[PDB]
Subunit: 173 residues, 4 copies
């Protein structure tokens, strides 16, 4: 039946990649998927003859009942949706395969959005690791911010963030 | 090479088992381990070879003992209010910290500081039990069979059951 | 819902431990298990034919040290096809890294394969995926433990 | 820090996808990768450090791999010199990663893959979804055309991923 799967880890780990792997897997079995991304203007990646949908939204309420038609819900950048838990649950309880790719922690390692709160509801949690972009010789589980902004929500990539190991995360300069 | 590893899931999944598997693994490599378990009890530092097991209510009660050890294994981590800071301070010192815990309580709310610890972990494995209601599906939640509201209620099979999703609401 | 699950890795990785974890898991759900070594039953046997039809009564078959059983594949398959949860803990490779028994040959039939890692008992600071033999015996089958084998990483091997 | 990592499972499981996820990981850390694919009727190379070859036997890469941090070999099952090659490289300190079918359409060991397992520091088996019953994971590959040959290159028009029950139906 229905469930919630969570894909977490730092930036540069391939979480989104893994989310889509699972999506393509379901499509080959002719199961209908609805991919939900967050309103964050940044370049992405049609190739099947199945039922496949793709929304970009600020709050999951904005999808209304659209999801009911679908077998599989894939939510990327889940950390930015404030109604994540209730939404995934309501859907999973309806018998939907809900999959969520997210940062578990922000640049200061504080719980990012409702992600840590979602964990108790998940039938599976996979944490991916990046490679450390400072020492290049250890896996990376944290994300360090290279610009001087305090705000938690700051959309961006390699020019503003680096994936790091433990030692490296505290290295000052 | 220091780090935090987290082992979670519902009751009856073998988390503690897995914690100890990893402990024995380290011992075979002559690496020293300090196993920290939870309620109202002892300390030991014998079998102290050149060639430990504590039970406590708060991790402060271990003082600096851990500094001598290669590997820290903390079972039932959910009950320790100073978990995050403790595992971090240790991991940063270069210690292999491993934690077995319930990620969620009987109402599926975050249990203790476990969910808060996740961002600090280099690894997170969630184990699954078998559903003890329908016996034909894996189990990821813990249901409470007695009528107590309190979150902290220590106990086993007579007070809790591991369940799948459908069963959890039945 | 029948299947084969394989638990492999070198010595000192806790394979047997992991096999039993899964067993206890099933018992708590009141599912009947039959543990085969080389509600709960436990046999010790040289060839799996020696169990006859006993397994038919059971929900879950756990086979430890599977590498030593020459009839492993056909047995696990026949059972899994009957709807049994068959679980196998084994060394995938011997001390010279050659395929041990019918284990590598079983992989294509498995719904799951987990390889566990030990800690390297030479350098103490890297995971271990191979088993080195410390005594000078050539024979592949040599039963024993820490006095005759060590788990190692690549460099150390 | 050298090693061999194996990614196996049936068709339609995303093995190749997973191989490339790991590759992009390494690249972000400015680590040089050399992706080696299979091809029978044609051989090919391209460099500028990320490289991509297509070849019939891994000997055809000569010493090119020595310059690289990370070797990714897709469809490893078709290379008869796989074990010795991955080992030689891993022993040199290379991160060797291999995506492959562990078994063929009749579930017999495909190429040298099962023989490579004892040499691997990691083995992940991916699962597809069953394309017959659509409601169970899939760990085997069934062939839908009538060819006996083991080597038959192709996709969804010639193969389906299945669960256990379905594989015999
Ligand atoms: C589910 C739950 C457990 N508890 C208590 C009761 C148990 O003694 C303890 C859970 O510890 P566990 O170690 O999870 O118990 P277990 O042996 O069943 O699990 P495993 O085999 O995986 O180790 O916490 C609560 O206080 N509140 C709760 O909601
Ligand atoms: C390495 C090796 C072992 N053996 C035998 C000796 C052992 O008794 C047996 C391996 O048993 P294991 O149970 O693998 O050894 P272990 O108990 O140390 O590891 P774990 O707890 O992780 O299961 O196989 C061989 O015959 N040839 C070999 O090359
Ligand atoms: C099953 C099977 C495949 N093949 C060939 C056909 C395919 O081209 C190739 C399978 O490799 P894959 O890369 O595994 O096919 P895929 O891309 O569908 O799967 P994934 O997404 O997991 O990478 O091997 C055979 O020659 N014989 C066989 O029995
Ligand atoms: Mg326990
Ligand atoms: Mg492919
Ligand atoms: Zn680093
Ligand atoms: Zn159930
Ligand atoms: Zn070593
Ligand atoms: Zn099927």
């Amino acid at each position: 039946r229905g469930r919630i799967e969570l894909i977490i880890g730092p930036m540069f780990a391939g979480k989104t990649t893994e989310l889509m792997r699972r999506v393509k897997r379901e499509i080959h079995a002719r199961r209908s998927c609805f991919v939900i991304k967050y309103s964050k203007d940044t370049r992405y990646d049609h190739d099947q003859l199945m039922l496949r949908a793709q929304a970009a939204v600020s709050q999951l309420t904005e999808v209304r009942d659209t999801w009911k038609r679908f077998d599989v819900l894939a939510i990327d950048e889940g950390q930015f949706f404030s109604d994540l838990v209730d939404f995934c649950n309501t859907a999973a309880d309806a018998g939907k395969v809900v999959m969520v790719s997210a940062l578990d922690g922000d640049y200061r390692r504080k719980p990012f959005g409702q992600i840590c709160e979602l964990v108790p509801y998940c039938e599976a949690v996979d944490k991916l690791t990046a490679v450390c972009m400072m020492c290049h010789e250890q896996p990376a589980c944290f994300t360090r911010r290279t610009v001087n902004v305090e705000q938690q929500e700051l959309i961006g990539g390699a020019d503003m963030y680096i994936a790091t190991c433990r030692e490296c995360y505290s290295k000052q300069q």
